Amino acid sequence: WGYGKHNGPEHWHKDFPIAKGERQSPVDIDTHTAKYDPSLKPLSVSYDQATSLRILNNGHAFNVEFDDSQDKAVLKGGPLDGTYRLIQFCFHWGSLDGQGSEHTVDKKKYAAELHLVHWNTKYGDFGKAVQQPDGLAVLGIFLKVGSAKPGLQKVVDVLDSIKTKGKSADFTNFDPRGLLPESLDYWTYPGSLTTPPLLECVTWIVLKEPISVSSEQVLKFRKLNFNGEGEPEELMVDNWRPAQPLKNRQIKASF
């Protein structure tokens, strides 16, 4: 799989039948239909003690990994039951500023989308959680083009180092707090991973408020390669999956 014309999103179903399941993500957030739910508690993001390890080019996106052996970077509250540990974050972006996000708001597409992946500590490890309906919590943050985002510059500058498929680089002392909007208002619904194996174990939490990034920050993302070093150059852009059918599910609002 990939995002090309012959191994793209519309082909995943062949290898990953759950592709056309009942709680697939991403979806379009119809703000007029979303239900304001008063029983929704505020989000609780404890990342002050986070420990980054590294960044790698997995051939479909780039990941910043975290040490999740202890409750260092956690997410709780909201619609969540128990503690969820930060394991990684990655992005989805497009060829142009008019495309790239996965989730859409009233059919509007953002320049990119940031996913903070967390797993339920009740299940002991990541691999056991992706076997549960409430195994993961993904924090989704939209990126619009405007002013630079200081907190993102550290990621931006190490891209050169992992241009191709399979590369990785040490990436310690990286504070994710630098990537959060001012507001923690959100939308929530039950869905899945947005990439194969597309397991339907995620509780999505899409922040309302987008973060702005400059044109040259986003530009550095478009310089990445899907291919491995020594193979024809195929730029890493449009690594986003198209909106899926809601199918009865309901999207709730904390505001």
Curated annotation (Swiss-Prot):
Designated name of the protein: Carbonic anhydrase 2
Annotated signal sequence range: none
Localization in the cell: Cytoplasm; Cell membrane
Highest taxon listed in the record's lineage: Eukaryota
Keywords: Acetylation, Cell membrane, Cytoplasm, Disease variant, Lyase, Membrane, Metal-binding, Osteopetrosis, Phosphoprotein, Zinc
Effect recorded for P197A: Normal CO(2) hydrase activity, but impaired stability
Effect of T195S: Enhanced p-nitrophenyl acetate esterase activity, but normal CO(2) hydrase activity
Native species: Homo sapiens (Human)
Entry's cofactor comment: Zinc. Can also use cobalt(II) with lower efficiency, but not copper(II), nickel(II) and manganese(II).
Similarity section: Belongs to the alpha-carbonic anhydrase family.
Annotated positions for site Fine-tunes the proton-transfer properties of H-64: Y3, N58, N63
Effect of Q88P: In OPTB3; in Czechoslovakia
GO terms under cellular component: apical part of cell; cytoplasm; cytosol; extracellular exosome; myelin sheath; plasma membrane
Lineage: Eukaryota, Metazoa, Chordata, Craniata, Vertebrata
Gene: CA2
Disease listed for this protein: Osteopetrosis, autosomal recessive 3: A rare genetic disease characterized by abnormally dense bone, due to defective resorption of immature bone. Osteopetrosis occurs in two forms: a severe autosomal recessive form occurring in utero, infancy, or childhood, and a benign autosomal dominant form occurring in adolescence or adulthood. Recessive osteopetrosis commonly manifests in early infancy with macrocephaly, feeding difficulties, evolving blindness and deafness, bone marrow failure, severe anemia, and hepatosplenomegaly.
Job description of the protein: Catalyzes the reversible hydration of carbon dioxide. Can also hydrate cyanamide to urea. Stimulates the chloride-bicarbonate exchange activity of SLC26A6. Essential for bone resorption and osteoclast differentiation. Involved in the regulation of fluid secretion into the anterior chamber of the eye. Contributes to intracellular pH regulation in the duodenal upper villous epithelium during proton-coupled peptide absorption.
Misc. comment: Target of drugs used in treatments against glaucoma disorder and breast cancer.
Outcome of mutating L193 to E/H/R: Strongly reduced CO(2) hydrase activity
Catalytic reactions of this protein: hydrogencarbonate + H(+) = CO2 + H2O; urea = cyanamide + H2O
Binding sites annotated in the UniProt record for Zn(2+): C90, H92, H115
UniProt-reported outcome of changing A61S: 2-fold decrease in enzyme efficiency, as determined by kcat/KM ratio, and efficiently inhibited by chlorzolamide
Substitution effect: T195H: Higher affinity for bicarbonate. Enhanced proton transfer capacity
SUPFAM superfamilies documented for this protein: Carbonic anhydrase
Positions contributing to substrate binding: T194, T195
E.C. numbers: 4.2.1.1, 4.2.1.69
